[PDB]
Homo-oligomer: A and B are copies of this chain.
Amino acid sequence: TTALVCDNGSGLVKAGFAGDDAPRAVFPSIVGRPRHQGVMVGMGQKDSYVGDEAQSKRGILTLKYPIEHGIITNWDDMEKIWHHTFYNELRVAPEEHPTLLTEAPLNPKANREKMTQIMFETFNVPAMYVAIQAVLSLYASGRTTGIVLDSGDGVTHNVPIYEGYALPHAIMRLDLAGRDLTDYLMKILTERGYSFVTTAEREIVRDIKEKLCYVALDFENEMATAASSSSLEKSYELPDGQVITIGNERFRCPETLFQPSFIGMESAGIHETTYNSIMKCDIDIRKDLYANNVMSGGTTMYPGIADRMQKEITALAPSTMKIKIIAPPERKYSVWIGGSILASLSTFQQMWITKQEYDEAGPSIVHRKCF
């Protein structure tokens, strides 16, 4: 039997089979409900729109994200998200297919309890596993050792692994990723005059961030260049036909990853998190973490981020030793890809959480069988 991989992240659900190259069902994770008064009768007015239908019909909908910083808050919405990604997107029966879900580290345990219980009692499987996303990104990178910085839509987490051994005391979690970048871009696009307040306008600001934004190599020189001349300004077309043109917000928005004090957070940037995660490890492996900085997630898809983080770590690391960022061209879907190699691995077949073991052990095996 083929296996399923379903990276159920904060922003985009990426689901597909095992052994495949690309994730077949990539769609954002939103539940849309109408907020106006429907006067027409007939022709199928649904009370809830999930997936691409909520994206297409977003001008009459309130969109709710069921996952916030990796922790599922609304569970009926996440039930509908799983129902849509099994029955409507992949068009599969979950009762005859194993399933590998992804999870950020340092998650509350009752979240994992409810994932296990709903996944085993609503969409009851033969087997299911819950994995760490950084381990799957290292599976996609094709190497055994390395430090992985994953940055999805809610969680940026750093996990270092050497020769198959993850160090749990060196794992760090930062609740700052693309949703907070989107909210900060909604805050700073109000300076130029463009007002965005609704949940539908968050998708337009997200499309602006995906299409135009880039990571600056040097922040102060880029601010001076944008203040001096309008060569860095770029234009975008809204769905109502209005044409916007933005300047420094192309590179002020991804700078929150390197400077978390923009949105009021006390914690340091992702480069200091990576350096402290390396420095928390034992000494003899640290060189092998400098040459294998694996990046993943859609937040690291800006076309200026690898040279910038190489510059920051090379400033932070001792100078007698090479820094090398491993940034693949397909690092958006690398969690799904490494889930596809791990689902197709022959040795992984003994590590499934079967239904019989769940019935014997209650919903408590997922603390002791998983990481």
Hey, which bits of chain A sit against chain B, CB under 8 A? 34-43, 45, 57-60, 62, 71, 106-110, 132, 135, 138-139, 144, 161-170, 173, 175, 187, 190-193, 195, 197-201, 204, 237-243, 261, 263-267, 280-287, 290, 317-321, 342, 345-348, 351, 371
Q: Is the CB of A282 within 8 A of B59?
A: yes
Q: Is the CB of B161 within 8 A of A320?
A: no
In this complex, the member of A35, A204, A280 whose beta carbon has the largest number of chain B beta carbons within 10 angstroms is: A35
Across the two chains, which residue of chain B brings its CB closest to A162? B60
7 contacts between A and B (CB under 8 A): A38-B164, A39-B371, A40-B138, A108-B192, A169-B264, A197-B267, A243-B318
3 cross-chain pairs, A with B, having the tightest CB-CB distances, nearest first: A59-B284, A241-B318, A169-B264
Q: A241-B287, A342-B41 are in contact. Are A263 and B60 (CB under 8 A)?
A: no
Q: A60-B282, A282-B60 are in contact. Are A241 and B321 (CB under 8 A)?
A: yes
Q: Is the CB of A175 within 8 A of B198?
A: no
Q: Is the CB of B282 within 8 A of A37?
A: no
Q: Chain A's interface: helix, strand, loop or mixed, by majority? A: loop
CA distance A109 to B247 in the complex (A): 14
Residues of B within 8 A of A108 (CB): 190-193
- Closest chain B CB from A146 CB (angstroms): 11
Q: Is the CB of A36 within 8 A of B165?
A: yes
CA distance A237 to B187 in the complex (A): 34
- Closest chain B CB from A161 CB (angstroms): 7
Q: Is the CB of B165 within 8 A of A201?
A: no
Residues of B within 8 A of A187 (CB): 106
Q: A59-B283, A204-B283, A282-B59 are in contact. Are A38 and B165 (CB under 8 A)?
A: yes
Across the two chains, which residue of chain B brings its CB closest to A227? B364
In this complex, the member of A38, A40, A175 whose beta carbon has the largest number of chain B beta carbons within 10 angstroms is: A40
Which of B60, B290, B342 interacts with A285 by CB under 8 Å? B60
Q: A190-B108, A266-B199, A286-B240 are in contact. Are A166 and B36 (CB under 8 A)?
A: yes
